[PDB]
Amino acid sequence: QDLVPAAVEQAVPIQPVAGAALAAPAAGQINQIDPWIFQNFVQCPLGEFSISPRNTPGEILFDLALGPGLNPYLAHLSAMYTGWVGNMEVQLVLAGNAFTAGKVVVALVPPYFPKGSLTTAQITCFPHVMCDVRTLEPIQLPLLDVRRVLWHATQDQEESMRLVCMLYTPLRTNSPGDESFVVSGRLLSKPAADFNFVYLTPPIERTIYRMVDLPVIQPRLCTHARWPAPVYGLLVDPSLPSNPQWQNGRVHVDGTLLGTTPISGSWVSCFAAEAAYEFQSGTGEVATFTLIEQDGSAYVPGDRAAPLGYPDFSGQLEIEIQTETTKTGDKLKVTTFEMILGPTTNADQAPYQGRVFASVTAAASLDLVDGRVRAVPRSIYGFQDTIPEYNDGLLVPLAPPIGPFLPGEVLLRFRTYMRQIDTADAAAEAIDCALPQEFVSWFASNAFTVQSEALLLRYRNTLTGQLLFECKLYNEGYIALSYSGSGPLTFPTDGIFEVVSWVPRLYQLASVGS
């Protein structure tokens, strides 16, 4: 005769996994870590998520892989080792309330289980813990090294054990009351008794598990990335188009440039070519340009739409070039030519094929010598923020349009002003970019590894450390804010962007408002 209790605590039953006892006969060395790293839970580099009443049951809230990039001490230490082996421990804290109903499941998913779409029925067939959003204290699970190899390489990230969290039952509030309410979650970890490193190497600085940082410069000392001018403004505007297809100033956070984006800010909306002048009788002397790369290399039609640094807007542009004449009384001068960029055919512009056309009006036939030039913009006429002609009328390789966003998110814009010709309006013609120069470099100089889908940034006052807003910076290189206003909203331009954490894609920012 026996008594079965209704209330039992909760636990995960395990079979022990061997670490360095399997690895040691074919490792070079087996290296120990400081014994007090085994004593403290420390927040994970990806250690923030949220829960809303807009999430639906089945959604995945976080997803973590075993290994050294879960602890900031272990990630600092991996710069001087070639491999790793052993077990870990994770801790979870939820900041909910008394009005909040809901459950989540945290499952342990092994390597080589096909990463498709899990359902709510299936998540409880793994080892798991059942948690609800009203808990005051933290929950912990083990994370074991179930594997087919003898050890792992710190610089190639292969298959390991994962930690998946799913929303089990919907999240509800009793009185309507709180539907703008978000639950915060945080993740923390330490290593368990049986974790080692493998082979001592020189400490390399540009390893993986090195954390991203931004350059410490205020946005008003910087340089616009689509037109050769400083940065003057910083704002967000729902009235404008949401998914622009700009082609300069676009870079991945892992460091790969895309579009015609150059490294230097002295290539921006400028070009270089071989020159050839003729004097068709009607208008004037006409210059046909055979395009090259600005470092003097040849141009080959490839996977961009033009050479690096080409203007990505429409309208009539003014250039200044050097000219060497064959008259009497002059040998060198800065000449002006007038050029049309937009979809304004009858001129047959095809910078994708390596030929552009321009002209200056002249009652003479000034014999200008053929050679090599560098053209720089002077003024713009009828500027539309739309792509120019790249082929004659044909489509070219492009970079995808900016996006996607979540419901409620909008795009952050850096603004500058262009020199223009205008007759009736004396307003300042504005142009935006997503990331300024000083940011497209510092990427592609550093080559970071993205470790998640977005980066959470805080923007502060350099003095008094006040918080101005929070934002998501996605891997593709654009920033989002949570903002549901209708008109514009501009921000002070002398702050500094911080780095907080890697976050998931479904992360819910706090809303900004005028």
- Name which position in 130, 149, 193, 510 contacts a copy of itself (CB under 8 A): 149
- Name which position in 138, 170, 215, 397 contacts a copy of itself (CB under 8 A): 397
Q: Are 58 and 227 in contact (CB under 8 A)?
A: no
Q: N- to C-terminal Cα distance for the chain?
A: 70
What is the torsion angle, in degrees rounded to the nearest 10, for the CA atoms of residue 274, residue 280, residue 282 and residue 287? 0
Sign of the CA dihedral running 125, 126, 127, 130: negative
**Choices 18-26, 410-418, 482-490, 499-507 (CB under 8 A): range interacting with a copy of itself:** 18-26
410-469 residues in contact with a copy of itself (CB under 8 A) are: none
419-448 residues in contact with Mg ion (CB under 5 A) are: 422, 425, 429
- In SS3 terms, 432-448 reads as EECCCECCCCCCCCCCC
Which are the contacts of 333, defined by CB distance < 8 A and separation ≥ 6? 322, 323, 325
429 binds, among Mg ion, a copy of itself, none (CB under 5 to 8 A by kind): Mg ion
Q: How far is the CB of 381 from a copy of itself (least distance, A)?
A: 27
Residue 488 CB coordination number (10 Å): 13
385-424 residues in contact with Mg ion (CB under 5 A) are: 422
- Name which position in 28, 138, 170, 371 contacts a copy of itself (CB under 8 A): 28
Q: Is 159 in the site for Mg ion (CB under 5 A)?
A: no
Angle at 66 between CA 64 and CA 71, to 5 degrees: 85
420 annotated as a binding-site residue:
yes
Q: How far is the CB of 427 from Mg ion (least distance, A)?
A: 6
Nearer residue to a copy of itself within complex by CB, 16 or 487 = 16
Sign of the CA dihedral running 487, 464, 185, 9: negative
494 annotated as a binding-site residue:
no
425 binds, among a copy of itself, Mg ion, none (CB under 5 to 8 A by kind): Mg ion
Secondary structure of residue 181 in the 3-state scheme: coil
User: How far apart, in Å, are the Cα atoms of 32 and each of 17, 23, 36, 53, 216?
Assistant: 18, 14, 12, 46, 36
Q: How far is the CB of 32 from a copy of itself (least distance, A)?
A: 12
Which of these, 414, 310, 386, lies nearest to 352 by C-alpha position?
A: 310
Distance CA 223, CA 96 (A): 43
String marking each residue 94-113 x if it binds a copy of itself according to CB under 8 A: --------------x-xxxx
For 251-306, give the DSSP string. B-TTS-B-SS--SSTTSTT-EEEEEEEE--TTTEEEEEEEEE-TTSPPP---SSSS
122 binds, among a copy of itself, Mg ion, none (CB under 5 to 8 A by kind): a copy of itself
- Which DSSP helix (H) or strand (E) runs through 189? strand 183-197
Q: Is 26 in the site for a copy of itself (CB under 8 A)?
A: yes
**Choices 145-153, 173-181, 236-244, 325-333 (CB under 8 A): range interacting with a copy of itself:** 145-153
Q: How far is the CB of 238 from Mg ion (least distance, A)?
A: 22
Q: How far is the CB of 98 from a copy of itself (least distance, A)?
A: 34
Q: How far is the CB of 220 from a copy of itself (least distance, A)?
A: 37
Distance CA 164, CA 65 (A): 9
Phi, psi of 140 (to 5 degrees): -130, 150
Q: How far is the CB of 207 from a copy of itself (least distance, A)?
A: 8
> Tokens standing for 139?
């929950």
Q: How many residues interact with Mg ion (rule CB under 5 A)?
A: 3
Nearer residue to Mg ion within complex by CB, 8 or 426 = 426
176-235 residues in contact with a copy of itself (CB under 8 A) are: 198-204, 207
Q: Which residues are annotated as a binding site for Ca(2+)?
A: 420, 422, 429
Q: Which residues are at the interface with a copy of itself (CB under 8 A)?
A: 13-18, 21-30, 82-83, 108, 110-114, 118, 121-122, 125-127, 144-156, 198-204, 207, 299-301, 350, 353-355, 391, 393-398
Q: Which residues are at the interface with Mg ion (CB under 5 A)?
A: 422, 425, 429
